[PDB]
């Protein structure tokens, strides 16, 4: 038996007041599998909000984002937990439809953050907009993606700067599995592999 | 949501003044931390001022130290920044952001939203 549950994004309904995902709202994110509408989070989800009588968000309250599978808008992350190096919560994002996009432009935004890796394994379509990966010191991986094959216009485009030097990622060993084909990865595992040289039983090679 | 425009950029007279503004719109009723950006060709971005809500506290990168000056005038929901004393160091794009609370930061992880961005010429 599938459910499923479509839920507002930031911006729309419930949330038309709110910045960003925050110890409030997650809440209502729960069993969501399709947001109708947008993603941000942004630093002050973490950092609390006195004006909006928001206290600072747990991390361990992203998990409730595992279920999303679908976003008709774009996602943002401009803000991100230290203590985690991946975008676990977005594990099981597949598609990103980007009808409405970042300043019209973006369609996922990862910005600013201290991750080593995206993780954004079940990531599969980005049915419309561009993709800005940009400001993350620590990042490795993303510079391996075929993006072509996730794309769905023949325009979109890819603003991939300001990370970590490929130099150092595969100085330090921060390089796709040998089980990955030339199509990139989202990180360092095999079920990260965007897809398998060999076989594949299932996610994993 | 809130947007924000830089405004006032230009090339200068090594050695001349300048006057950048920001204008925000949107849900701009609330409080909001604003500070000022650069970003010099092959660098990272880095801060140059920062302003409270209510006005009071203010802060300014050493580089930057005397010639600056951040101001703000929230019923017309501006922040400006004088820049005297310019030098070809000081050339970068100039960005405009905005943390919601009443605090300024003197980081980039700290900042909601972020402008557009004017270049800087000296």
């Known amino acids: 038996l599938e459910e499923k549950k479509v839920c507002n994004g930031i911006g729309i309904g419930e949330f038309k007041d709110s910045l960003s995902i925050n110890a409030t709202n997650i809440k209502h994110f729960k069993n969501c599998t399709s947001i109708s509408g947008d993603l941000h989070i942004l630093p002050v989800a973490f950092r609390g909000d006195s004006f909006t009588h928001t206290p600072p968000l747990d991390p361990q309250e992203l998990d409730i984002l595992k279920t999303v599978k679908e976003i008709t808008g774009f996602l943002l992350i401009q803000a991100w937990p230290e203590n985690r190096t991946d975008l676990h919560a977005f594990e099981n994002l597949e598609i990103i439809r980007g009808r409405t996009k970042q300043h019209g432009q973006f369609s996922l935004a990862v910005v600013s953050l201290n991750i080593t890796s995206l993780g954004l394994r079940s990531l599969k379509e980005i049915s419309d907009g561009d993709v800005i990966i940009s400001g993350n010191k620590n990042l490795c991986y993303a510079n391996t993606i075929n993006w072509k094959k996730l794309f769905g216009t023949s325009g979109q485009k890819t603003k991939i700067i300001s990370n970590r030097g490929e130099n150092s990622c595969k100085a330090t060993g921060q390089v796709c599995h040998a089980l990955c084909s030339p199509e990139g990865c989202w990180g360092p595992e095999p079920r990260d592999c965007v897809s398998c040289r060999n076989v594949s039983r299932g996610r994993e090679c | 949501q809130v947007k924000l425009e830089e405004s006032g950029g230009g090339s200068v007279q090594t050695g001349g003044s300048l006057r950048l503004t920001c204008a925000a719109s949107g849900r701009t009723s609330r409080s909001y931390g604003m500070g000022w950006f650069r970003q010099a060709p092959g660098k990272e971005r880095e801060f140059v001022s920062g302003?409270?809500?209510?006005?009071?506290?203010?802060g300014y990168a050493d580089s930057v130290k005397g010639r600056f000056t951040i101001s703000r005038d929230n019923a017309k929901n501006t922040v400006d920044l004088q820049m005297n004393s310019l030098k070809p160091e000081d050339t970068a794009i100039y960005y405009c952001?905005?943390?919601?609370?009443?605090?300024?930061?003197?980081?980039?992880?700290?900042?909601?939203?972020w402008g557009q961005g004017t270049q800087v010429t000296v």
């Open positions: 952001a905005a943390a919601a609370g009443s605090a300024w930061y003197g980081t980039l992880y700290e900042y909601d939203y």
């Open positions: 302003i409270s809500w209510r006005g009071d506290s203010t």
